[PDB]
Amino acid sequence: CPLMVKVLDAVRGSPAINVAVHVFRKAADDTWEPFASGKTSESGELHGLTTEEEFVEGIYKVEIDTKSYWKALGISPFHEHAEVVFTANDRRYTIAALLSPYSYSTTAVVT
Amino acid sequence: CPLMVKVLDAVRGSPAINVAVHVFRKAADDTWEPFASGKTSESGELHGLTTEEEFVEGIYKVEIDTKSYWKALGISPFHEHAEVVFTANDSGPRRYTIAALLSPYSYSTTAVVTN
Amino acid sequence: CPLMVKVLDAVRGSPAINVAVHVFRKAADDTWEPFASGKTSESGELHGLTTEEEFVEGIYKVEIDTKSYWKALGISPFHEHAEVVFTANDSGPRRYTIAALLSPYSYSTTAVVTN
Amino acid sequence: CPLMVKVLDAVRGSPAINVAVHVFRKAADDTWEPFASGKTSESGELHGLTTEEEFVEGIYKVEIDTKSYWKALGISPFHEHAEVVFTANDRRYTIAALLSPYSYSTTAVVT
Ligand SMILES: O=C(O)c1ccc(-c2c(F)cccc2F)cc1
Ligand SMILES: O=C(O)c1ccc(-c2c(F)cccc2F)cc1
Numbered sequence: 319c320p321l322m323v324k325v326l327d328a329v330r331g332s333p334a335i336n337v338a339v340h341v342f343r344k345a346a347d348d349t350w351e352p353f354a355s356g357k358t359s360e361s362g363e364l365h366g367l368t369t370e371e372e373f374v375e376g377i378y379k380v381e382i383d384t385k386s387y388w389k390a391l392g393i394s395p396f397h398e399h400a401e402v403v404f405t406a407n408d409r410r411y412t413i414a415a416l417l418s419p420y421s422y423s424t425t426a427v428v429t
Numbered sequence: 430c431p432l433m434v435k436v437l438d439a440v441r442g443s444p445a446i447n448v449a450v451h452v453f454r455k456a457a458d459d460t461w462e463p464f465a466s467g468k469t470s471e472s473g474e475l476h477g478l479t480t481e482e483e484f485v486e487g488i489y490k491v492e493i494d495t496k497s498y499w500k501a502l503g504i505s506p507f508h509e510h511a512e513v514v515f516t517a518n519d520s521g522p523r524r525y526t527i528a529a530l531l532s533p534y535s536y537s538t539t540a541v542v543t544n
Numbered sequence: 545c546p547l548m549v550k551v552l553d554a555v556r557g558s559p560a561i562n563v564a565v566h567v568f569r570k571a572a573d574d575t576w577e578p579f580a581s582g583k584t585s586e587s588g589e590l591h592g593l594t595t596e597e598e599f600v601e602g603i604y605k606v607e608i609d610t611k612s613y614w615k616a617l618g619i620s621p622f623h624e625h626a627e628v629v630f631t632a633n634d635s636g637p638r639r640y641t642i643a644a645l646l647s648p649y650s651y652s653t654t655a656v657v658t659n
Numbered sequence: 660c661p662l663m664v665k666v667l668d669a670v671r672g673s674p675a676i677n678v679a680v681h682v683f684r685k686a687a688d689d690t691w692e693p694f695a696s697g698k699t700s701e702s703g704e705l706h707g708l709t710t711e712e713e714f715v716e717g718i719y720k721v722e723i724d725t726k727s728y729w730k731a732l733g734i735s736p737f738h739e740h741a742e743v744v745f746t747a748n749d750r751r752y753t754i755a756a757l758l759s760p761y762s763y764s765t766t767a768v769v770t
Contacts, residue, residue: 329647332769
């Protein structure tokens with residue numbers, strides 16, 4: 319697994335489950351191409367987005383649909399989504415996000 | 430101001446000075462139109478981006494150029510930038526502070542919204 | 545001031561108002577002596593804790609009573625409080641801002657230190 | 660495992676390895692008793708601190724020796740340590756901390 323995603327809920331102290339995540343790669347023409355997507359699991363994780371063959375060097379955007387997550391909990395959140403944009407330049411990338419209605423934090427663990 | 434940005438540096442324990450910030454507003458045709466830009470001051474703050482008249486309802490993107498910040502200090506960071514996307518003024522005018530706390534492989538952002 | 549505390553609420557997107565804060569200083573005998581206390585204002589800030597004269601070198605503990613904050617709002621949070629422990633003024637006088645961003649099961653803290 | 664700890668490094672985007680962690684329980688007399696300790700692994704994790712038998716309801720303090728971690732990297736950090744103080748009131752508790760020289764963040768994931 320070259321790329322994983324993890325999402326936590328800072329209000330409830332739980333994984334953030336069933337959160338939609340879309341990944342994009344920047345194309346030559348400077349636009350974003352759909353690359354991979356999924357929903358976080360019961361553990362707040364999304365594995366199997368890509369393979370090491372397909373995950374070549376490039377600029378990637380990971381978009382986390384935080385607004386839907388909070389709306390489902392009856393909470394009016396601030397952000398439309400959380401985006402994480404980074405260059406992958408070669409082994410394993412974990413993109414983690416910790417969510418609150420008016421705040422989020424993200425870190426990369428690269429091993 | 431109705432829109433202020435504040436950026437802090439978690440490595441140095443200081444304001445993040447001279448960080449470029451670009452603000453965009455989503456246009457009728459669903460593209461991001463330039464709205465305002467600036468750089469953070471010696472206090473890590475950026476004021477004067479817009480007026481209450483021009484800051485109408487809409488979806489705004491605040492892009493904080495964190496990579497240029499860390500590279501100007503000679504560090505190779507993870508992220509290209511930090512983006513904060515939000516709907517503004519949809520229940521009348523509010524004042525927004527977007528705060529960001531930066532490290533080379535992590536950032537945090539919060540919003541303080543007052544009426 | 546040489547010591548200020550600022551607290552924000554990540555659930556409401558607001559300053560965290562009326563948060564109790566107790567500051568202690570490590571004594572010669574290795575126990576925590578009361579140094580100062582107060583509550584955050586409507587802006588989430590707490591000033592006037594100490595003077596540059598009284599804020600000598602030492603190890604300080606800033607305890608932010610986050611549990612009392614969340615319970616006063618009727619939420620059951622995880623932490624008892626948030627503690628920030630640091631050595632101060634060991635290379636001469638500095639001004640310290642301790643900032644905290646609060647959620648029921650998480651908090652973040654940073655320091656801004658200026659000369 | 661009723662209690663785990665995890666530590667990440669926000670500067671380098673890596674687990675924080677070989678970080679000393681001490682756990683304490685509040686005794687009747689309102690003092691802190693040593694309860695458990697260890698060093699984080701290569702994955703930045705500390706498992707096997709306690710058993711479900713021994714991890715009864717009570718107030719616990721988890722102290723993370725962040726100052727030594729940064730000092731070993733040639734970095735002068737702000738905090739003496741990071742402390743996480745909480746009541747355990749019954750299944751599984753993960754205490755995570757994300758570290759920078761002048762900042763740290765901590766969350767509890769309770770499942
Ligand atoms: O200067 C402020 O008002 C301020 C300082 C720091 C933070 C902050 C943050 F942006 C992320 C995480 C933790 C923080 F305290 C928020 C606001
Ligand atoms: O268990 C993890 O992988 C994990 C836990 C917590 C965090 C995190 C974060 F993404 C931002 C702020 C504080 C945290 F502990 C990151 C990763």
